[PDB]
């Protein structure tokens, strides 16, 4: 679902993540550890329990955008998120962090459901 | 309440804008025209009838972020927003657009309530 063209941009740009709290306030922030798990899934290392973790545990809603500012290209990924503290995703996030950052409090997992282009704005699911 | 360092980042980086629709779904998109108006206000040129505009019109809630791709630097600005199609901001937005982009459909105005230093600073004001 995530194409090699998309992967290239993902691996060259910063993940910008939007979530929402209970009262409907959007929250935005970069996730510099955001990376692909497979062709339909992102993971990131959750180290702080900031608002993003709270929002995901509340309602699971999320959007991730990557933009190539220079070439005016990008992608928006829409899906469901969860937080895990045990299991395969978490242990992988733990190993990835070793020698790199602190031991993760949790791992965030994003299940991609729809993909949109960020020049056009059109659904790029084919 | 705006640092010169903040102004530098804002001028050199792309605003990413988060809003929410009437059903509570988040939306994120870039707005290259997002720019500081004064120390408590951003504006951007709205050239579309897209989701960011729809969401601002619905509930006014917004957060914007400017982040350096290559360095651990950036700022988050949280506040409320409105869309205008007439008045002084809109006239200013039209003048700004010439030689930069198309004639705007509207102007978005963001009233800053809180500032966050993103990767190294927590709150900044």
Numbering used by the authors:
A (entry chain B): 1 to 126
B (entry chain A): 1 to 125
The paper states:
Hence, spy49_0662 was expressed with a 1.4 kDa C-terminal V5 epitope tag used for Western blotting followed by a His6-tag for immobilized metal ion affinity purification, and the resulting protein was coined as HupZ (heme utilization protein Z). The tagged HupZ is a small-sized protein previously shown to bind heme, and it exhibits a trace heme degrading activity in the presence of NADPH and cytochrome P450 reductase (CPR). This protein shares some protein sequence similarity to the members of the IsdG family. In summary, a comprehensive biochemical, spectroscopic, and structural characterization led us to propose that the observed heme binding in HupZ is through its His6-tag in a sandwiched di-heme complex from two subunits with an oxygen-derived bridging ligand.
Next, HupZ was crystallized in the primitive orthorhombic space group of P212121, and the structure was refined to 1.7-Å resolution with one dimer in an asymmetric unit. In this new structure, six and seven additional C-terminal residues are present in Chains A and B, respectively, compared to the previous structure. The C-terminal region, including the His6-tag, still misses density for 39–40 residues. Comparing the structure of H111A to the wild-type structure, the two superimpose well with an r.m.s.d value of 0.99 Å over 237 Cα carbons, indicating site-directed mutagenesis did not induce an undesired global structural perturbation. His111, as shown in Figure 7, is located on the protein surface in the homodimeric structure. The ligand-free HupZ eluted at 18.0 mL, corresponding to a molecular weight of 36 kDa when compared to the calibration curve using the known molecular standards on the same column under the same separation conditions. The molecular weight of monomeric HupZ is 18.5 kDa, and thus it eluted as a dimer. In all experiments, the higher-order oligomeric states were observed only when heme was present, indicating that heme binding to HupZ induces oligomerization, resulting in higher-order structures. Our results indicate that each subunit of HupZ binds heme in a 1:1 ratio. Collectively, the rR data coupled with the UV–vis study indicated that the heme in the binary complex is in a six-coordinate, low-spin ferric state with at least one histidine as an axial ligand.
